[PDB]
Amino acid sequence: SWHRPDKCCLGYQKRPLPQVLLSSWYPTSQLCSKPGVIFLTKRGRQVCADKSKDWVKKLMQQLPVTAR
Amino acid sequence: WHRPDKCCLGYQKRPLPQVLLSSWYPTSQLCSKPGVIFLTKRGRQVCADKSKDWVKKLMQQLPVTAR
């Protein structure tokens, strides 16, 4: 059927992620347990981040949002 | 690595036919809503409310997915 499961963020990257490691990002659904953005690292690695923090918002600016 | 988790953000309305299903898997316990996921013969993933009668019966019946 078509009622797919959705990637949510349950945890949050503690240590701020450096820009040079990241390739892009996409936000999570508004219905997720908590608000979350997902940063794409240049080896496909997806890391959850807490968007209510100064350093993550930085990356949300500087980084292009996931085409997928 | 704080990877995203597959959580069930909505529940399959009507019951699923068992012969269309190969196996089921529970979401992360830290997911907001406590739903299960089914594997079809096709390989599609379907969210289900484990608080229904037709979903638990399908859980007894079918094998638990291999994470």
Side-chain angles (χ1 to χ4, degrees), chain A residues 3 5 7-67, chain B residues 2-12 15-43 45-66:
Chain A
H3 220 136
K7 318 294 257 11
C8 286
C9 275
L10 300 198
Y12 288 136
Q13 163 60 217
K14 0 85 144 3
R15 359 130 216 124
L17 273 222
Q19 232 268 318
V20 260
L21 287 70
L22 293 353
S23 145
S24 67
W25 77 274
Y26 56 113
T28 64
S29 140
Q30 267 315 161
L31 323 174
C32 272
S33 182
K34 332 189 246 25
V37 336
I38 296 161
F39 291 113
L40 288 223
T41 79
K42 266 155 289 215
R43 245 120 55 120
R45 291 67 197 58
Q46 299 162 342
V47 190
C48 268
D50 185 0
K51 79 218 270 109
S52 107
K53 269 154 210 309
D54 290 339
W55 74 276
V56 54
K57 295 202 271 56
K58 280 358 269 276
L59 304 162
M60 301 194 291
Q61 279 176 122
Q62 305 179 315
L63 280 175
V65 117
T66 303
Chain B
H2 254 285
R3 315 202 262 132
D5 263 277
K6 266 170 295 231
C7 281
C8 272
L9 258 34
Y11 294 140
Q12 148 75 329
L16 291 135
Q18 170 148 13
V19 342
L20 285 63
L21 315 183
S22 343
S23 58
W24 71 287
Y25 188 65
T27 38
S28 162
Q29 260 151 214
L30 294 155
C31 282
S32 200
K33 238 175 346 291
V36 308
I37 305 178
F38 286 100
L39 249 1
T40 42
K41 314 261 115 42
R42 320 226 236 193
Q45 278 162 77
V46 197
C47 271
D49 199 339
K50 43 175 324 232
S51 98
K52 319 307 286 73
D53 247 11
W54 66 269
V55 167
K56 23 194 94 243
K57 65 135 294 90
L58 287 156
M59 285 151 70
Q60 311 179 348
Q61 293 211 281
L62 291 149
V64 67
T65 325

XYZ file of all heavy atoms in Angstrom, chain A residues 36-65:
242
model
N 12.927 18.066 13.481
C 14.279 17.670 13.134
C 14.670 18.009 11.713
O 13.876 17.907 10.781
N 15.931 18.404 11.519
C 16.500 18.460 10.178
C 17.560 17.364 10.040
O 18.169 16.981 11.038
C 17.106 19.830 9.848
C 16.453 20.907 10.706
C 18.611 19.811 10.043
N 17.751 16.869 8.827
C 18.738 15.848 8.514
C 19.778 16.382 7.525
O 19.422 16.758 6.408
C 18.110 14.583 7.906
C 17.171 13.825 8.840
C 19.197 13.651 7.396
C 16.225 12.888 8.121
N 21.031 16.416 7.952
C 22.155 16.863 7.157
C 22.752 15.709 6.362
O 23.042 14.662 6.944
C 23.274 17.458 8.025
C 22.860 18.775 8.654
C 22.690 18.869 10.024
C 22.644 19.881 7.854
C 22.291 20.065 10.595
C 22.237 21.073 8.428
C 22.058 21.167 9.795
N 22.946 15.925 5.066
C 23.607 14.890 4.270
C 25.113 15.085 4.243
O 25.614 16.115 3.780
C 23.031 14.897 2.849
C 21.601 14.349 2.745
C 21.452 13.434 1.547
C 21.244 13.629 4.039
N 25.871 14.105 4.738
C 27.329 14.226 4.649
C 27.793 13.651 3.312
O 27.062 12.866 2.704
C 28.066 13.528 5.800
O 28.133 12.118 5.553
C 27.310 13.698 7.105
N 28.980 14.024 2.856
C 29.438 13.677 1.514
C 29.735 12.199 1.303
O 30.319 11.819 0.277
C 30.678 14.521 1.171
C 30.326 15.788 0.405
C 31.378 16.871 0.594
C 31.338 17.435 2.008
N 31.664 18.888 2.027
N 29.339 11.326 2.227
C 29.469 9.886 2.008
C 28.120 9.209 2.238
O 28.019 8.030 2.563
C 30.543 9.273 2.901
C 31.731 8.701 2.143
C 33.023 9.392 2.536
N 33.279 9.360 3.972
C 34.342 8.803 4.537
N 35.266 8.215 3.786
N 34.495 8.824 5.856
N 27.069 10.004 2.055
C 25.711 9.529 2.220
C 25.252 9.555 3.667
O 24.047 9.475 3.917
N 26.188 9.664 4.605
C 25.856 9.669 6.021
C 24.829 10.756 6.343
O 25.111 11.928 6.115
C 27.078 9.910 6.907
C 28.105 8.806 6.961
C 28.807 8.620 5.627
N 29.498 7.336 5.555
C 28.930 6.148 5.696
N 27.628 6.033 5.922
N 29.670 5.050 5.608
N 23.690 10.351 6.872
C 22.662 11.256 7.360
C 22.752 11.409 8.872
O 22.770 10.410 9.592
C 21.275 10.742 6.965
C 21.096 10.655 5.458
C 19.935 9.768 5.057
O 19.462 8.967 5.862
N 19.493 9.918 3.813
N 22.814 12.643 9.349
C 22.901 12.910 10.780
C 21.802 13.878 11.211
O 21.631 14.940 10.613
C 24.285 13.467 11.160
C 24.471 13.514 12.664
C 25.375 12.621 10.510
N 21.064 13.489 12.238
C 19.978 14.242 12.836
C 20.482 15.447 13.617
O 21.486 15.348 14.326
C 19.180 13.335 13.782
S 17.790 12.511 12.977
N 19.791 16.577 13.503
C 20.226 17.770 14.229
C 19.056 18.551 14.807
O 17.972 18.627 14.224
C 21.061 18.649 13.310
N 19.264 19.157 15.973
C 18.222 19.947 16.609
C 18.195 21.382 16.083
O 18.989 22.216 16.514
C 18.403 19.958 18.130
C 17.270 20.666 18.838
O 16.340 21.155 18.157
O 17.287 20.742 20.084
N 17.260 21.650 15.184
C 17.103 22.934 14.517
C 16.808 24.104 15.438
O 16.754 25.262 15.009
C 15.976 22.833 13.476
C 14.589 22.909 14.093
C 13.637 21.955 13.389
C 12.944 22.643 12.225
N 13.433 22.138 10.910
N 16.599 23.883 16.735
C 16.316 25.071 17.556
C 17.611 25.671 18.087
O 17.608 26.489 19.006
C 15.348 24.709 18.680
O 15.975 24.658 19.946
N 18.742 25.267 17.502
C 20.026 25.749 18.009
C 20.785 26.574 16.981
O 20.713 26.405 15.769
C 20.868 24.566 18.510
C 20.632 24.272 19.989
C 20.910 22.820 20.335
C 20.051 22.345 21.495
N 20.113 23.261 22.668
N 21.548 27.536 17.492
C 22.241 28.508 16.663
C 23.112 27.883 15.586
O 23.123 28.377 14.453
C 23.086 29.414 17.577
C 22.189 30.314 18.410
O 21.024 30.528 18.010
O 22.641 30.811 19.462
N 23.853 26.822 15.902
C 24.791 26.276 14.923
C 24.074 25.498 13.828
O 24.532 25.486 12.685
C 25.847 25.383 15.587
C 25.328 24.050 16.028
C 24.681 23.798 17.207
C 25.396 22.798 15.338
N 24.347 22.468 17.287
C 24.774 21.833 16.154
C 25.922 22.382 14.111
C 24.657 20.490 15.794
C 25.803 21.052 13.758
C 25.179 20.113 14.585
N 22.964 24.841 14.153
C 22.242 24.093 13.123
C 21.575 25.065 12.159
O 21.613 24.902 10.940
C 21.201 23.137 13.725
C 20.261 23.881 14.657
C 20.405 22.441 12.629
N 20.957 26.117 12.692
C 20.361 27.116 11.800
C 21.405 27.690 10.852
O 21.092 27.967 9.693
C 19.675 28.216 12.609
C 18.485 27.715 13.419
C 17.528 28.850 13.758
C 17.938 29.509 15.068
N 19.351 29.990 15.006
N 22.632 27.850 11.340
C 23.729 28.290 10.489
C 23.796 27.392 9.256
O 23.735 27.847 8.119
C 25.082 28.250 11.196
C 25.386 29.420 12.109
C 24.265 30.447 12.086
C 24.509 31.509 11.023
N 25.402 32.596 11.510
N 23.931 26.096 9.528
C 24.053 25.137 8.434
C 22.829 25.141 7.533
O 22.953 24.833 6.349
C 24.305 23.732 8.999
C 25.546 23.684 9.911
C 25.512 22.450 10.788
C 26.813 23.754 9.071
N 21.668 25.482 8.075
C 20.443 25.433 7.275
C 20.446 26.553 6.247
O 19.812 26.499 5.194
C 19.234 25.507 8.203
C 19.401 24.306 9.117
S 17.685 24.729 9.472
C 18.107 26.234 10.315
N 21.211 27.590 6.583
C 21.414 28.704 5.666
C 22.425 28.325 4.580
O 22.100 28.300 3.395
C 21.903 29.942 6.413
C 20.839 30.762 7.118
C 21.471 31.902 7.900
O 21.178 33.079 7.693
N 22.365 31.527 8.811
N 23.642 28.055 5.021
C 24.833 27.882 4.217
C 24.739 26.684 3.281
O 25.446 26.608 2.289
C 26.066 27.683 5.111
C 26.302 28.772 6.144
C 27.530 28.474 6.982
O 27.731 27.342 7.429
N 28.354 29.493 7.194
N 23.868 25.752 3.640
C 23.768 24.475 2.947
C 22.502 24.429 2.100
O 21.489 24.975 2.536
C 23.824 23.342 3.977
C 25.226 22.978 4.474
C 25.188 21.937 5.579
C 26.075 22.476 3.312
N 22.593 23.813 0.931
C 21.426 23.646 0.052
C 20.564 22.490 0.552
O 21.095 21.536 1.132
C 22.052 23.347 -1.306
C 23.391 22.746 -1.021
C 23.807 23.222 0.335
N 19.254 22.575 0.356
C 18.330 21.567 0.864
C 18.201 20.406 -0.123
O 18.120 20.637 -1.321
C 16.929 22.126 1.164
C 15.874 21.486 0.276
C 16.589 21.912 2.636
